[PDB]
Symmetry: C5
Subunit: 317 residues, 5 copies
């Protein structure tokens, strides 16, 4: 029933750092509906909701409520502001307290807040992609030559992480594109003009459209890069899978030569041991039996080995 | 020709728990068509049908007919109300008998019933996902290190279940989105106003659209989670498939050393048994033949083993 | 140039069972075009064509021409009516000869014929799915435990059949959806009103739309069931493919123990046969050489076997 | 700068067979643009372009320019008319020189030319599919039982050809559908009426739409057939891939029995050769040592073989 | 804060080759927005942006700003103009300084610049495809017969390159199609007319649409060619993967014959060595024991080899 909240007024000055806010006041004086509170509490789906007097943004690490005179950043009650959140808060305060008075390119409060939010989200996405891209190239280069046991596990660890990052980037891009495809939602975001009884209409929304298209393309570029990386990983895996079976056949063929050699040696040993029996061979007292038998055994071994090698060469041809 | 029916009147009071209803009365006094009855009897396709005076909802475990003054929950004649059905009935009764009189955020009878129906469906989907997600992480962690025989069967059992749950969630999300994409269907659901000769029109349907979008996003989140889980399972399977062939080559290479050792031993044994024949060797009575022959056999075995090992190292290089 | 035709007049009475019809009369007095005849002769693509005074339906086993006062069922000249065709004809005759006069839910001749056609097509699709689904579960259950040679062939026979049935169901669903997406085609199917100089218009087509949506959903359900079955088959195949390689490694590892045993036996036999040569061993007349040599050979065999087993355990670790 | 051209005037009479035409006259007196000439020279992408006074068709083997009073068929300067081109020219001449005067179903010059072009393209596509379909069934039937070396190469040759034909058919179907999806392009093809200061408008294009839909469906049917064939090929490949590993395990298991037999024989031979040493065995002069030792060796061989077989049966269980 | 810039005035004369330009002047006097500068600095996503008074093009190697009287080509500050950039600049200068005065087919300054830009991009894409296509056919032809170790690595190197080129071509085609799908963007590109207080409107954009469609189709053709090449590579890989396992079984079966031969030789050697023991055989002094024992051993070896071969033939059947 409580949330940690940081509040900024219309002058860009922080009046609350890590205060506690009851979700009842959100319905009371912020134009929200009772059914939207459960989206604020716990939701990992990036989205942008346009209300008659407020804008709700849930993008990765940012949960923001933007009005024409106030900005709220909320999160779980028990927590502390992270470094990206502090950097975003500093940038938003600096951009809001500019108090500039330009000409044609002047932007209101809510658009200046949305621009900072989108820039922070895009910067975080780019940083995450740069942090995740580095090990993949190294492990692919290491797997180019040899295939070990632990490198496959490293590739397994990296592939799912890359796929999850690509899915998150696609979700953010689709969340932006969904808002980019509604004319009434684009027209209803002019909160400053609605406070002066001025309504824009569903056909004059150039500024917000131009603001959103740039970040849409920025997210699309990272999505394409992640898709290319995934395709490269898939190709490398599909090639090494066949490389394994290609290099196994070398050992499979090498074993047969040793098998043929053992067969020839056994064939020679059979005839060598035939004459070792305690029987009558009729040539025991001769002076030529030993050399003749040795030569016959050697010739038989050689011819059987040659026949085996010839048959192997014919088969493998 | 009979169905089990639970009835709630316009005051939120239950007047029938598990009564029997003939399908003829549905056509008689509920604004249904004769061809829709077969959808009520047996259908596993989630859908929402908008009639001039009634709304038909078939979502998983809920078969509901909603009017401006009555609510019916129907199912097969021979059955009993389940725990989710009883919880949904209790929640619907509690929300209907509130008798609240709000301001701008007041909702009619049919919208209050539809909100409870959608909340029950989303809660059941979330519970099913939480129940199905747990074993997958454990079996993936167990398969990270070693690959057994039964763990693959467990993964087979879990994968099809996860895919079926993802398909069911996608079907529910698409059923909601189909209703979200029709302006006339959205405009025709204002049943309370049509009883006072007041018609809304195809351009003023803000309340029902805002009601439906939240549950659409709630279903989309679970769909994305299931898709991520399926992708992780696929990556793990594709990696272990190559891990098997990677670890087989170690034994394939280890066998060749034993083969070379056996070949060397056979080569030595051939010469050892050559001198065991009952023939004339001319060095039987000498005092140096035994050691010389033993040394020659040992040297031949050693050199053939060394040549085999060198050839194996050259091949595997 | 001839077709087998069955004709039903406006009163639901059959006047021709298996007559012969020349395709020229179709252009002469049925409002067809010369280029459509080739679709009637031989075409396996389900479609529905709307003409200014006729409707042409080609759905699986039905080739029907529907007018406001006549119904034709045509097929190849040399053939006989099948059992599904006879059942469809009986149902159509029974529904047409009802001569009922209802109130708000009264339907004209062409709509009553189209409803029967769609019901017959959906019933045949459901029967085909029920006939094709049964063997798949049994063969998957049989393949859950053991993988034989003929069961894989049975799975091969069943998979292509299931895929073809799913493709046919998707084609029928898309053929229905194509007609459901044209306002002018929906408006031009009111053939009865066009005979009284009454034209409906592209914005009042509630009856035919409601009639078609039910059968569209009926086909979609069978499509989803077939898709689920295909996914289950794919998962089972992808799991058994890895099960094979998982169970091969057991025999691959078991062979090495026998190899080590043979190596140890050969090592022992070498020393056993070294002392069998007809040379001077200097310990032939002693009373301790035999036992000493036997013990040395046994110890050498045991230690080499132990070293081989230890190396195998270290490698497989 | 030159093309081979065949010209037909408005009366259906050929005045040029294989003449030479400079591409400058196409811009001069045919309503083409300078940037379109490069599409006429060399392009393998089927397309239909609608000009204010001409129609350009590039479909497979046909490069045609159609006007309200003239038809041109062009190709590379150095070439000769093929048999399909000659058949198309004969059919077009025969259809143009009919000089028929019908009633409601009368078609102008350009529509009569387009109908012949589309019929020729569809006939050629059907002939190509019929020529490519035949060997696939035979090779699949041959691979159903046994898997050889050359049959896999034949399947490799056929699969890419089938995929390329399917891609070409899909490209033709998409080229037709692109023209079918533009109202202004459909309205601008009434070249005959534009010569009498009569303009049709983007809402009256029934004739050309009905003409194009038939050939669109004709191409879609062949696309579906090719897709079914590709799916069957994929299923057959995925099944034989597992059949190979299924039948390898039989030989893998059969080798172990021979290994156990060799181990038992070696175990027996070790004890047989232990008593062959030239040492003192103390039972040389007895009349029972020979049979006892033979029986002991045989029993040891039998028991070790039995233990090996039992262990193998336990492992394979 | 600086970029390398080449400038061309309205007469087609170059006044700056490799000058330095500060990005502030782009906002000052070129109609750009402060948020677009980061797209000019570093972006690999091809896009076309339409401004009220300028057009920004980022296509591969071209970063161009087009106005009604000036053309800028910009890139990183530290760099030099490449050969494609110089060729594009020469072609653009030649086309701009034509000073032609045509009739109906006259084009303004910005359209003449855009045509040259698109022609250069298409020519570079075609050249890249022609350079990348050649090695693939050769390596596929080499892999058709035999499968080596390095050829698989070459295929791995080529496959990812082909996929990346296909992705780049698809990105360029989609970038063109995105501009082709906006009526307001097409209408706002008439910069010359807007300088004379003449506005076109969202319904008269024939010239630019016809200009863009040709290059859209040109890119689509290369996309289709790349897709066909990728499909061929995938089919070849999937076939050689099974070819490997098909040819392994030949050696697997050949090893068993040698195993059976060794088993038979061992069986014969066992009986040959049984009679070599120093025991009483009772047939030592006979004149028939030697031949009888030799024949018995040979017959036993032959019968066991025959039984093994018969069992192998029965198993492999
Ligand atoms: Mg993952
Ligand atoms: Mg807009
Ligand atoms: Mg825009
Ligand atoms: Mg890629
Ligand atoms: Mg021996
Ligand atoms: Mg499943
Ligand atoms: Mg709306
Ligand atoms: Mg909305
Ligand atoms: Mg994912
Ligand atoms: Mg051996
Ligand atoms: Mg199939
Ligand atoms: Mg409608
Ligand atoms: Mg509807
Ligand atoms: Mg499924
Ligand atoms: Mg191919
Ligand atoms: Mg139309
Ligand atoms: Mg139509
Ligand atoms: Mg299929
Ligand atoms: Mg001896
Ligand atoms: Mg002796
Ligand atoms: Mg790649
Ligand atoms: Mg247009
Ligand atoms: Mg156009
Ligand atoms: Mg292809």
């Amino acid at each position: 029933p409580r949330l940690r909240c940081t509040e900024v007024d219309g002058n860009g000055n922080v009046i609350m750092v890590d205060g506690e806010l009851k979700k009842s006041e959100l319905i009371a004086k912020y134009g929200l509906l009772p059914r939207d509170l459960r989206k604020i509490d716990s939701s990992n789906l990036p989205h942008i909701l346009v209300r008659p007097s407020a804008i709700l943004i849930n993008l990765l690490h940012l949960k923001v409520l933007i009005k024409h005179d106030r900005v709220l950043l909320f999160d779980v009650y028990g927590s502390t502001s992270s470094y990206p959140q502090s950097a975003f808060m500093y940038d938003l305060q600096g951009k809001l307290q500019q108090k500039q008075t330009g000409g044609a390119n002047s932007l209101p409060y809510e658009f200046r807040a949305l621009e900072a939010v989108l820039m922070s989200v895009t910067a975080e996405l780019e940083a995450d992609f740069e942090a995740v891209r580095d090990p993949v190239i190294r492990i692919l280069s290491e797997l180019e030559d040899d295939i070990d046991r632990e490198k496959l596990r490293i590739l397994l660890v990296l592939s799912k992480r890359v796929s999850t990052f690509e899915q998150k980037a696609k979700l953010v891009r689709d969340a932006i594109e969904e808002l980019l495809e509604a004319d009434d939602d684009l027209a209803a975001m002019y909160l400053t003009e609605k406070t002066h009884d001025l309504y824009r209409g569903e056909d004059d929304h150039t500024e917000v459209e131009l603001l959103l298209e740039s970040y849409h393309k920025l997210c699309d570029e990272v999505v394409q890069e992640a898709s290319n990386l995934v395709s490269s990983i898939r190709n490398t895996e599909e090639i090494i899978r066949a490389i394994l079976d290609a290099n196994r056949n070398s050992l499979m063929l090498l074993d047969l030569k040793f098998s043929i050699g053992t067969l020839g040696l056994a064939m020679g040993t059979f005839l060598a041991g035939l004459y070792g029996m305690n029987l009558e061979n009729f040539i025991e007292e001769t002076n030529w039996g030993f050399g003749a038998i040795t030569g016959l055994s050697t010739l038989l071994s050689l011819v059987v080995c040659w026949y085996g090698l010839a048959k192997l060469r014919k088969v493998q041809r």
